[model samples]
Target: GYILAIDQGTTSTRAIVFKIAGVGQKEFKQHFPKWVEHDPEEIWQTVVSTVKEAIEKTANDIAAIGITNQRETVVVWDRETGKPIHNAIVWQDRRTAAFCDKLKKKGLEKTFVKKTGLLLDPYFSGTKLNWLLSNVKGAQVRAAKGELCFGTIDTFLIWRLTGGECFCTDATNASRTLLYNIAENAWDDELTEVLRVPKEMLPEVKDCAADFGVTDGAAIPILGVAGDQQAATIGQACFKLKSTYGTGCFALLNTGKMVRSKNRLLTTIAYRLDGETTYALEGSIFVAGAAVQWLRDGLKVIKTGSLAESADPSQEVYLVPAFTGLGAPHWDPDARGAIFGMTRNTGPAEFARAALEAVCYQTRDLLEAMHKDWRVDGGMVASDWTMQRLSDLLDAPVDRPAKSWARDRRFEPHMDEATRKVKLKGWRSAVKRTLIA
Candidate 1:
């Protein structure tokens, strides 16, 4: 499934989709240029149109969507009517410059940074929001009555994307708002009441890769927000999940919260619903069945891709596959390929095993990096299959649909943990010597 990005920028909006191959992008519009002021209506239209164009150009059926926008630009909209109450106050708008002067005299700068991890100025969202409530007639009264939703561009786009089912923003976005308490990871009740902002207007704070809810188009799950890995985290799930077994082979474990990655790995968002966030850890890998394709197309060792996995595992040859490049845990695009433990008598079966085995070892590299943080479900998947060969290697059981059975022999991992570790060591060593330069 395609992951849709609704990028609401300061001056324009864009959309993009990512899959195993590459990415596609397109732009749609907005109002007047340099950060004066404009209708959220005009901006909202740009987000709507840009996302539509991205998916039309990428995966026709999108899997999920994420949002990243100007951090402090503000949008206050009606919950029932789905209409913006005023033009968005741009992050650079000086409408609140006078008021920021007033708030500073009130001795709130230290308290502001201590509580929100940001300095006080017309630059932060709280001041701009304060200006709108104070300047707009009866705005505070309506806010108090729970009639509105206030958000930065991230949440504003989410509200529109899921047709109102999702109303949230991530910590990186929330931390800039003067109303947010960085340590507390939630909107500060004191800050809101202190600034006379209605708590009712705030969007829910969230983790990047959690369920933001579902979109109206093709029932695609609007499962999360952005940062490249975050997008792939959800993309891996939506693109695979209960749909079928003919999906990605590599699996990702989401801790759902942060944990330090010790084995040359990192952690990331799986969720942060209701002010929750991860002190999380994450990991990734690059090569897969495509390595086997190289075996067939380049070496002509394998007659068919399906038979690559049937290679004798007893053969010790292994490939550190970086035909194009290595990714994630080791981002070396310049890295090339290498093979280990080959001999004159090794033959095609051993070479096929090495290529297919390369995919297995690369995936387990991620596992070795995150042995402790495995939590949650519907984890990440890295897709590849020289169609038939990849499956037999994993010995993974699968599901496919049709009036006919399609294919039957299920592949299952036969190696023990220690055996896998042994093989992984050999494979990684082969690639460690690749002349990426």
Candidate 2:
């Protein structure tokens, strides 16, 4: 009759209670927001408080709880005390990059890809789990003895709700953990051994709609669980291959029951229901609207009020906000932001326009990669419109294809060396007109 969805995001956690009136309708009863922090311990505590608060507020009418969260954020805690051994590792932290590098150097990348369906990247939970055990004093030993527990945000929330009696993660969250074997539907023992995470610490894997035990004496059934993006996919009804654009754009093309990815995108389980898993290829853009925010906040070149009103129609500039990293196709975290074609006449309005265009360029890059990976081998094809835009962006001619051109071939000698020949000529041309136009 009622489904309470707890959507825990990167910056905040929210609990939305929906009362189903019919097949396709619901009423929003209550929504609670909770703070999220860089420190994982603070996040865990906030999560506990938020869940309890939500339960207290909506316990009367809610029939089930559907948990969704930011995937790959990991927490390891003591099973007895229910206290985390160290701060939770937020998804944004790159401390595990070195660990990932080590794994890659060991030539274990293919093993992970084959078994767990994930690449050796710091974005996953394996390295973070290892970091927690190595850095958090007695975590390693305690975990080996089954005295400690590990979970992502969804698993953590479910554990707290069930009073630590249930330790489980749904397919979507488990898929993000490099330790889980999506095909086998279990945690890979070899992965745990390599990452140095004790097998006992991991949670039991379950389908999205499986019985994940009940919370409180009221026997409130925990009906469904999925990572935030996958849950959003479900919410948006992206049943087929489709892309969704937001602050940071992500393109997920559903591949039905197959696990397939190319173009530096992740091949991930879209969702698992009734023991059947559907997979999707996901391409992520790390910075999109954030580039605009950077101009307003970081550069202070534009006022908030003038951002909309001061649009310059003729100004031409491009801001490639590769800050902090690029993802999918370009996967280069080291690539710094670049501003192209800046002249004395260029102003803030042109810069803003360029920032938006950078997003389009990056998306085009990802689409190209996907096309090569999927289309080259005669696999399922993407839309022709998507393909044509990608082609236009790549094959389009450049404005100033060359920096300079030689003109006036007539040879002349000058008496003064400063004058060089009879006369040296200078020419100026609009670069954008040569390129985009």
Candidate 3:
């Protein structure tokens, strides 16, 4: 039996079938416009497809399933239809920045920190939920009557996987929403009331290791869940002021007991397990790598992403990647991405570098805020192909099966040279002559 780890990200989603013996990964797309958006149907089908494909390929029976996802990005759906009222409002999408500013002007920012340990920022889910309630058709009427369900990525996946039998999110995910009360360990009436978010829209909060419920149609049990950043914390042992970069950028400072913040950073649950719960201060960058991706996909600067890695040496091209709006310290959801200082010399490489540097600069924005807000000492996780969960799992770099590399000398000639040569000649000649006829 194996354990499946599903990583639901901003630009992409991954379902990995893991066994003590070996590992394989399958990645598929999640919809991300300049303003962050995700279709619940697309997300659900893709997750199931990825999961089943991995298991089918590996022939591995999942002993358990664990989920870690981009935190703060939100989805609101109907209980009866199990369909989303709107595309998920991504953490990076600061579409509601104006509304957040209004809340701040009304003296609700103080209340946000006191109750939810978060600042009045669009990176959290509260304002996003409020937006959906106000924007979606008849949503207010339905929601006021207890007709909607709201959750983060993890909760949404749990709902889909369990056939809508359960609607739950972990404490770590909940803490990032600006709707839950960290000190009280429940949703705060003040925060929710101030934000005008309906009380019925939230989910049952649970510990990381508790039973989240089984896949409704399948016998497999969902054993646990965690936020992507918190998962990294456990994986890397968030020893001190730290950060993790995936779909979003999170720089967190461990804050236990003193769950208070005067600065602009957010207070969040670090992790909850085995009769113990911990906390941290987080500065969130909603659109990080996705901004570079936007340049690549939107500008098409020479086929970007995991497969392509050609750097464009364009410098000092300040790209404020506020596509979904700015997050943290600034917290402007209404802000859009803008480029400063573009000359005629600026071309594809410039665009590429602009996108790349935008992510770095935004992360720098987070790091700076986390520092200013906490006056805290710091260390870094840097960033890597490092697998914190795998390390946390079979323990560390556990000695096991060693596989061979592609040896230059080793060759297999299954097809005769004459036959291959003839086929190759025929294919090329046909391509030139008549559509590879």
Candidate 4:
């Protein structure tokens, strides 16, 4: 029996039916400027179109359907008509930074982390949900009366796919929302009260693999679901460590027991199976491939990503890609991107190189924290140059998945200690410049 896998990511909707056989992808529009928003209907339409595109190639009956999505994004919608009350507040949105600070000043950051295994950052869904409830007309009252529904992208897609029959999200997605108590594996009432998010609006949380519901059209049983990174961990069968480089870079170090991160890294639900919870220490870098994307689209510095290879090695240009503020280890939402040590000769090549180097430099920070807690691994879709540079910066071997063009290559560290040290020092200095208070 064939299975349909839907991956709703930050920038795109992708659908694949395996045997990874037939696949379809659609890139969605990104509305940004410290705040990011996606039209929920547009995302839903992409899912519908992509699913149709994926299934068209084969005549095999889809026995079951699985879903994975970008977590922490907040979507508030009407229960009656299944229409979003506002554009989905993306995980990358930092509009709630002031709200986060208000709560943090009240000395509730630790309280939040202790219960939810998440810091009180704008990256989570709770504050964003709070924003919608208060900003959107009469949303708070409507939510309290169960007229509204709050969900992450997975739950949103599941609801749409099942014709609004299922209002559920897996534990992995729930855990990212700053509301779920990872220890107890349920939504925390006290936390929700603090964020002023109504508990009734929340979706029912389930295990990563469970009977979600049946799709409206194919009548296929929706079997398994997980947030994208957690799903990638399971997909790779990563027993220890894994990192995904997409719009953002997320590294997950699986610790069988719930191991608290001493290094300001996030403690998150890796995945739940058979009613059992597995935890991971996660370090999130808000920009990875997105930086390269910026070079191409935002600045138009380079027409192609390959142009980065032509960068001048003599230029010590450093880019602290806090485009949407910093993530793990720092958690500073006020910080913005910074470029340092630019000279007159610094042009497209320097910019592109700095953009690529920023990903590797940020990753080195995560790897350091992991070393202090637990050691681990990386991902696919990374350029050969980037992987080699990552290994050089980390001073370790980098392995690429065999599935990436069905090619397996290992990048070994070649840089001397002094060079790596100097490069890291400059990167750290650039980061320090971006952080506010």
Candidate 5:
């Protein structure tokens, strides 16, 4: 028997049929800025088309389909016709910034963080869902009457693939919504009321691996589901600490116990299995590869990241890369990107280095907080220069896979302590300039 896996990411959809491996992939268009939206129908079509291609190349007798998707990107659809009420609001969207600000002003952030283990940031689904219900015609009333359903991409895709038979989301995805009570293992009531979301509209939460439902035609059972990062954590079997870098960067530390973050890091479900919950501490940075992306798309500075290697070692330039505001330790939605310590000599090489170094700096912010919180030790692409700089900046060794996780290339810290201290101080000063005072 074979297994089919679907990876619905931030920028692409992929389906892999595993009898040892076959894959079909497709990239979809990403819409505009801080208010990102995706056509829900387009996402579904990508899933269908990719799955079709993957299944054709693989053998028969597939066991089950497992799904991993972008966390916190949500869609609300009509229960009857199964059409999205509005565009899927991505995790990166900040349309609810003002609303989040209002909540913070009301001093409700503490209550929210205590219950959900998440900050009152617009990066979450609660405010986005509230915006949809309030803005869309009759959505609120319909949702209250149980005529609507809300889910992250995994739940939405599951509903479509199973022909509306399953209306559930996994614990990992649920944890990102700012509506689930991580300690209690259920959707929170106070949170739902505060967000103005009807409880009836939410999907049933389940373990990472369970009986989700069966697909319509092939009748294959859907057995597993997880948010993309948690899936990566499980896939890598990273028991201690792991971080993933893509459009955004996320670091997750497996704490086993439901340890709360005192340093503004997110506390979330690492994974749930057989009704047993495992908790984690997560540090999220909104920009990682997107900084490099800005170099290509916004600044047109360099063609590839390697160009950054030519940066002058004497320069103290810094790029805050807070294009969509900072996450984790500093949850400031109003803050924007900034560059500091520039001189007449600073050019494309300096800009490129600043962009990549921002990723490392922000990563240090995460790991620093993680270390303080519970005494734990823990991407910016696979760039050699970036990796080495990251190890140098953190003053720790970085382990990269040579082929397997066992055979590895380690980048050891070699920078002088004086240089490391000065660089970190400069980065901190640069970040301070970007924060909301």
Candidate 6:
């Protein structure tokens, strides 16, 4: 028996065939690229064509299929014809941010956080769903009449695979909808009403590894499902607390079967197997490799591959790559990239160094927020120890120090000498003492 993992990523759709060999699973992948933007009609056609290509290429040796996809990319489709009503609103697109802000102003932020375990961010599906219903001609009426259906990419794929026979999504994907309550494990009616998404349009929620139904005329059973991150968590066997680093960095702390979140990091369903649901706390950083890209593309400071080779030890520059805004804890989309401590002496080497340092700085920020939210409150000094221990365990170094000990000791070693000497000749000695105090 073989497990086919259909990893439907943001840039492309890929089918990986994993066969059990010896003690582990070995796999091979084939990719199908996708367009970034399209007319609704074009996107639907592309989706079907890509899946067919994947199936045609790998249908021979797969026993069961496990699907994982970019979460919160929504599609609204006609129930009768199985056709999309509008372009799939992508998770990266900020088209629905204004709509989300409107809800935020209405004090729906806490309501969403309390119920959905998510912020009222356009990164999720509900606002996009609401935007489509309100803007697309007659979509609201169609949704109310049960003629329109809404789903994330995974749900859309499952429906298409089963020939519209199964209109369901797993817990992980559903959690990204900002409609499903992580605590209640169902769609929150009050949230739906607030978002103006009709309940009828939503897909049935299922467990991650439960049978979503058979596909390809029942020749293949769809045995597993999850949002891409959650599926990756399962695939990496992140049974204990672990973090994933790719283009962006995500740290997920497995909290067994219960939900626990801190610092605006989401508490969500990790995966479900044997009717048991596992939970995880997720912290997301939008800029990782993106900072590197800015150095290579935006600044033209270094070529892509040369960043690793051109690393310098002497230059001290820091870049806060807040491009595409900040994510997690800060959640400030308005913050732009800032570079500091640059002099006429700065060059490509310094720029490259700053870009790498930005990732470290961002991770430090995330870890601090995570620690605080998890009730593991410690001083910055103690938190550094904790972070070092975690990094050592993962075989990665926590390079960001809370304070530059060498720099601090060199300059501000002790208060006594600097304060007393600086104030010794002052006529207003009492004022100086008070100021020092």
* Reference-based TM-score of each model: 0.51, 0.74, 0.76, 0.95, 0.93, 0.75
Q: What TM-score number comes out for model 3?
A: 0.76
What candidate 4 gets wrong by more than 4 Å, as runs, is: 58-60, 304-306, 375-380, 402-407
lDDT of 1 by residue, 1-437 (tens): 35656645444565666633223343333333533465677777666667666555433455666576655678888887667888887654544655666777888756765676445555568988888888788887888888888988778777876788888877656755778875667788878887899888998877665777776636776665543334333534432112111111223455543334445543334334555553334343444554555676667777634454556656678777754445445645456567778766687877876765665556555654555445111111223343232333333443322232233333345446676556656766786777444
lDDT values of the candidates?
A: 0.58, 0.64, 0.65, 0.84, 0.83, 0.64
Q: Of the candidates shown, which would achieve the greatest lDDT relative to the real structure?
A: 4
TM-score of candidate 2 against the unseen true structure: 0.74
Task: Point out the higher-scoring one by lDDT: 4 or 5.
Answer: 4
> 152-257, model 6: which lDDT tens digit per residue?
8888888877778888999888888888988768888899988888898999899887888777534777878898788656654466544444445566667786
- Give the worst 10-residue stretch by lDDT in candidate 1: 239-248
Model 3 lDDT per residue over 127-196, tens place? 8988998888889888887788889999989987888888898889988888888877888888788768
| Predicted structure 4, TM vs. truth | 0.95
lDDT of each residue in 391-429, candidate 4, tens digit only: 999898866653322326777887899999989999988
- Please identify model 1 stretches exceeding 4 Å from their true place: 19-35, 58-60, 226-437
Candidate 2 per-residue C-alpha lDDT over 1-437 given as tens digits, one digit per residue, 9 for 90 to 100: 47776766554566656543212111121111221125555555666556566656534576887888878888887788677676667654556666788888999999898887667776678888888888878768888898889989888888877878788999889988899887878888898899877788888898898888888736788888998778756754466633333335556666787454544678788998888888877776666656776787779786622342354644445566755445665555444566766777778776765665555466656666666656110011122322332233334321100213222221122225432111111001221222231
The true-versus-predicted C-alpha distance at residue 352 of model 4, in Å, is 0.9
Q: Which stretches of candidate 2 lie over 4 Å from their true place?
A: 19-37, 41-58, 217-219, 242-247, 296-309, 313-315, 344-348, 373-437
Return the lDDT, model 1, position 111.
74
Model 3 lowest lDDT segment of ten: 376-385
Instruction: Return whichever of 3 and 5 wins on TM-score.
Output: 5
lDDT of 1 at 304: 30
Better of 1 and 6 by TM-score: 6
- By summed lDDT, the worst window of 10 consecutive residues in model 6 runs over 404-413
**Winner by TM-score:** 4
